Amino acid sequence: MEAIPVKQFVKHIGELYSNNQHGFSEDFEEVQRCTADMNITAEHSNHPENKHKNRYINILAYDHSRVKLRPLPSKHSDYINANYVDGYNKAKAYIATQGPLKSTFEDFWRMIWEQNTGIIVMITNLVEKGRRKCDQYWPTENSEEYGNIIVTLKSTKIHACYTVRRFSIRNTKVKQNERVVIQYHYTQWPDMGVPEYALPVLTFVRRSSAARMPETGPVLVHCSAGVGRTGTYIVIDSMLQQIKDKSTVNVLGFLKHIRTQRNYLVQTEEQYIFIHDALLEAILG
Ligand SMILES: Nc1cccc(S(=O)(=O)NC(=O)c2sccc2SCc2ccc(Cl)c(Cl)c2)c1
């Protein structure tokens, strides 16, 4: 189970799809079992003092890979539900994290400053099908203050399927010192069912990924829980890098791997199939 030449990957997709996606089903179940003989601790996520900091009681941040906040003059001011995740070759190329709650906007922006993140990839809407997915952690307009980071919205471009917001943030307890942070926000979400046509996404991935500057902190990627759509993004992004580099693909292997770094990355078979549709589009296009 290693890399597949890009020229036979497309053929492979045919096989995975046939007989009602039986092959896709076997792959993803392998992925879900891939953790089986594996205990990964998330004690910090389960600590009573950190509970109100998790959006979902079941969606945790593995200890070994968790992003640590600089502790504050309490014992658990270091905790945020987030994990470093690997990209193509490069270790810790992403921070995959949940959609921020009101009570964690400070942690969220502190992490971004502390990690020197320059790009945010947002893969949810605040509200979807009437349900709360994510609290708005940025200024509707002008500036807003979170802890010692105050964020200023500088410009916005709204496309068919996503929006790009350029922020300038300054730390007040520095010097102040300022950074640009660019948010890529995918906004095109189904009233009924789930996303299906992968081409607009491929474009989103291509443009947000190309926005990464040398040599900066990891790209922050979040949806709501920070595992499903977030994992889909990371795999599509990484595999496109691999294709450019070596003209080979390894979805099943890379995914089993990043699954050790954050629980449930790529959460459903449908998302798993979607990754393949995205990459098929890139290859044929
Ligand atoms: N159970 C469950 C958990 C989380 C999400 C869902 S869900 O909404 O029903 N299901 C989904 O979100 C699905 S299912 C197939 C594709 C997608 S998302 C495709 C997509 C869109 C924009 C970007 Cl930028 C990327 Cl990289 C990928 C279901």
Cα of first residue to Cα of last residue in the chain, in angstroms, is: 27
- Provide φ and ψ at 82, rounded to 5°: -160, 150
Residue 194 CB-density burial (10 A; 0-12 exposed, 13-18 middle, 19+ buried): exposed
Other CB atoms within 10 Å distance of the CB of residue 269: 16
Q: Is 272 in the pocket of ligand 1 (CB under 6 A)?
A: no
Phi, psi of 186, deg, nearest 5: -80, 130
Q: Is 191 annotated as a binding residue?
A: yes
Please state the three-class secondary structure of 31-54 as a single string. Answer: HHHCCCCCCCCCHHHHCHHHHHHC
Q: What stretch of H or E contains 250?
A: none
What would the two tokens of residue 72 be? Answer: 């504050």
- Nearest-atom number in ligand 1 for the CA of 224 is 4
Sign of CA dihedral 106, 108, 109, 111: positive
For this PDB entry, the determination method is X-ray
Before 128, cis peptide (omega within 30)? no
- Supply the CATH number for residue 258's domain: 3.90.190.10
Backbone angles phi, psi at 180, to 5 degrees: -85, 135
Ligand 1 pocket mutation pick from 127, 194, 227 by most atoms within 8 angstroms of CB: 194
Structure tokens, 79: 């905790």
Give the length of the chain.
Answer: 285
Active site residue 134: no
Instruction: For strands 119-122 and 177-186, give the pairing.
Output: parallel
H or E element: which one contains 261? none
Query: Domain range for residue 213?
Result: 1-285
Per-residue DSSP letter, 154? E
Contacts of 73-77 spanning 24+ positions with Cβ under 8 A: 74/49, 75/49, 76/44, 76/47, 76/49, 76/50
Please, what sign has the CA dihedral across residues 7, 230, 145, 170? negative
Q: Is 231 in the pocket of ligand 1 (CB under 6 A)?
A: no
Tokens of 45: 């996520």
Phi and psi angles of residue 192, each rounded to the nearest 5 degrees, phi first: -120, 140
Q: What is the number of structural domains in the chain?
A: 1
Give backbone dihedrals phi and psi of 189, rounded to 5 degrees, phi first: -125, 140
What pairs with residue 150 in β-bridges?
A: 145, 170
Among residues 175, 184, 199, the alpha carbon closest in space to that of 138 is found at 184
Contact 226 CB / ligand 1 (< 6 Å):
no
Q: Is the CB of 270 under 6 A from ligand 1?
A: yes
Resolution to 1 decimal place, in Å: 2.3
